[PDB]
């Protein structure tokens, strides 16, 4: 019935493609990132998703069991599929914390991101809140309290820490309570995000200067199309959104009937995920284009007002549509006065604003708060959207934590030493203790590090290992014969070609290009808030942050080879 299709939708719609995708799309030039993603969907999404589902269905085991049955000296990869998930559980729930925060500041008539606080004389606005938008000031100062540079970090902020603790308690409560009731929840926890995004698209397309954002998002600029970072980010994002590498897909496929259809399931899941991500990006970039157009209008208005006040002009004589000509006339009238303010005049254009209006790990929150503050009944829409985002985050965290606990649940030694219900509490406590780092003054920088590198190389390496093992280790012909015996209609030559030498080759080529780019540039830099300019400035990563990122990647990458060496020694 339609319940199965709704369950597939719920598995496909998650916090990943709704929150992470718009920020990546804006970072990498919009269309110049959207084109690879689709290309990275028909090549790496559907084939690898179907391979994972088929492996899970055929093996009738968990992730560790499935990757141990195929080959002994490869079973360590099953441990790796845990480690990455662990790191995800380290930081992903932090997102929910922010949601909680942004929910709790939604029951006030003067919304905290609606009106800028006064300087103190009760006559003007804060310099940071004047240079930056109200939403950006609320996000970067009253929510994260971010420090200008990663080198200087303060103590653990108590309010974000409390929000994170609340998020972890909610996750633990959901773990203890729900195990099989989701069948009812799927009737409601799967269609609400689509309704919310429909409402926000309705609002966004009614805003002035909204189509500029869509035109920017769908424009594939060839200048930035050749950036390897865009391809690598698209690949890691599609792998993170589909759930590849985490091992949850294999665990879910192990619980389904041997005659259950998988090709249709994989294609439907992949296409639904891509379409949902595209729709969310459309809405977010409509709102972002509205913000950029509003900033452009504001800058033109400020320049026009300044020129009118310094040249004794009429209130309406100088407009945006006839600016430069008038300036030229002033250049012909008396350049002595014109040069007195020539450095003061600013050159503002739509392209530059669209490139740098809003950016960072919190593009979704800033953009949607901007959209909410331009509504009719702001509080209701804010509550609905943040509840939807919190529900998506809780569902994704439930899936990830179940994938983490399942190998630990299967541990006979662990189960006989501690109660099964206490392992979840211990995991939640440890994850909260580790994730308390992201609540410092510079915690957002660490969150950015763990959003860029805790899932980039690890997922790609795990997927490459899986496709190599199912490609040549077990034998593609044997796998096809087993699948044909299980269900018939043996794999079409498209799937066999994709699994044989297309996906591994493409992933290896992307990795080589990324490594070469990093080696040649050698300038891995992060964005940092600058209150004086009220913008984002690129700054070089310090040594210790690079060491932390390298260690985080290296543990996940070396989880497999170390266990392979251990198994080889055990054999020898």
């Amino acid at each position: 019935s339609l319940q199965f299709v709704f369950a597939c939708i719920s598995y496909a719609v998650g916090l990943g493609n709704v929150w992470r995708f718009p920020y990546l799309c804006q970072m990498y030039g919009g269309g110049s990132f959207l084109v690879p993603y689709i290309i990275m969907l028909i090549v790496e999404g559907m084939p690898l998703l179907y391979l994972e589902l088929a492996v899970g269905q055929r093996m009738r085991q968990g992730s560790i069991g499935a990757w141990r049955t195929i080959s002994p000296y490869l079973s360590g990869v099953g441990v790796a599929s845990v480690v990455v998930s662990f790191f995800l559980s380290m930081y992903y729930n932090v997102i929910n914390a922010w949601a909680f925060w942004y929910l709790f500041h939604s029951f006030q008539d003067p919304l905290p991101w609606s009106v800028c606080p006064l300087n103190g004389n009760h006559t003007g606005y804060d310099e940071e809140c004047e240079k930056a938008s109200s939403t950006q000031y609320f996000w970067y100062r009253k929510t994260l309290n971010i420090s200008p540079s990663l080198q200087e970090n303060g103590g653990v902020q108590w309010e974000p820490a409390l929000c994170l603790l609340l998020a972890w308690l909610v996750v633990y409560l959901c773990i203890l309570r729900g195990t099989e009731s989701t069948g009812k929840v799927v009737y409601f926890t799967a269609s609400l995000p689509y309704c919310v995004l429909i409402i926000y698209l309705i609002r966004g397309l009614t805003l002035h200067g909204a189509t500029n954002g869509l035109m920017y998002m769908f424009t594939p600029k060839i200048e930035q199309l050749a950036n390897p970072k865009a391809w690598i980010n698209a690949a890691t994002q599609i792998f993170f959104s589909l759930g590849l590498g985490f091992g949850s897909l294999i665990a879910f496929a192990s619980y389904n009937e041997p005659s259950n259809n998988c090709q249709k399931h994989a294609i439907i899941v992949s296409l639904i995920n891509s379409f949902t991500s595209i729709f969310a990006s459309i809405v977010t970039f409509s709102i972002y284009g509205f913000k950029a157009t509003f900033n452009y209008e504001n800058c033109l208005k400020k320049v026009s007002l300044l020129l009118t006040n310094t040249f004794d002009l009429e209130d309406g004589f100088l407009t945006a549509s006839n600016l430069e000509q008038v300036k030229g006339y002033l250049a012909s009238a008396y350049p002595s006065k014109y040069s007195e303010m020539f450095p003061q005049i600013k050159n503002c254009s739509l392209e530059s604003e669209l490139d740098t209006a809003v950016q960072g790990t919190g593009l979704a929150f800033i953009v949607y708060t901007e959209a909410i503050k331009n509504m009719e009944v702001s509080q209701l829409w804010s509550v609905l959207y943040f509840f939807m985002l919190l529900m998506l985050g809780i569902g994704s965290m439930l899936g990830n934590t179940a994938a983490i606990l399942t190998p630990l649940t299967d541990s006979k030694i662990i189960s006989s030493h501690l109660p099964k219900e206490a392992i979840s509490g211990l995991v939640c406590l440890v994850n909260c203790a580790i994730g308390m780092v992201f609540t410092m003054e510079a915690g957002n920088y660490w969150f950015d590090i763990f959003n860029d590198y805790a899932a980039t190389l690890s997922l790609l390496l795990i997927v490459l290992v899986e496709t190599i093992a199912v490609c040549y280790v077990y034998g593609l012909r044997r796998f096809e014969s087993d699948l044909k015996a299980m269900t018939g209609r043996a794999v079409s030559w498209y799937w066999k070609v994709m699994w044989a030498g297309v996906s591994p080759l493409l992933i290896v080529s992307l990795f080589v290009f990324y490594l070469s780019d990093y080696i040649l540039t050698g300038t891995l830099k992060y964005q940092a808030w600058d209150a004086s300019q009220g913008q984002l400035v690129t700054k070089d990563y310090p040594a210790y942050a690079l060491a932390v990122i390298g260690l985080l990647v290296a543990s996940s990458t070396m989880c497999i080879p170390l266990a392979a060496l251990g198994t080889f020694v055990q054999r020898r």
Binding site: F100, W101, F104, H105, F107, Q108, L162, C163, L166, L169, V170, Y172, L173, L176, R177, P419, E421
Partner: peptide, 29 residues
């Protein structure tokens, strides 16, 4: 402080729910 009051209420509700769930689990023991 609207947000602090709402956070306190939500935390109390979550604490009560977790306490009753753990009590039921202990009963399962």
């Amino acid at each position: 402080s609207i947000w602090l009051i709402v956070f306190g209420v939500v935390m109390g509700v979550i604490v009560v729910g977790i306490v009753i769930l753990i009590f039921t689990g202990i009963r399962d023991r």
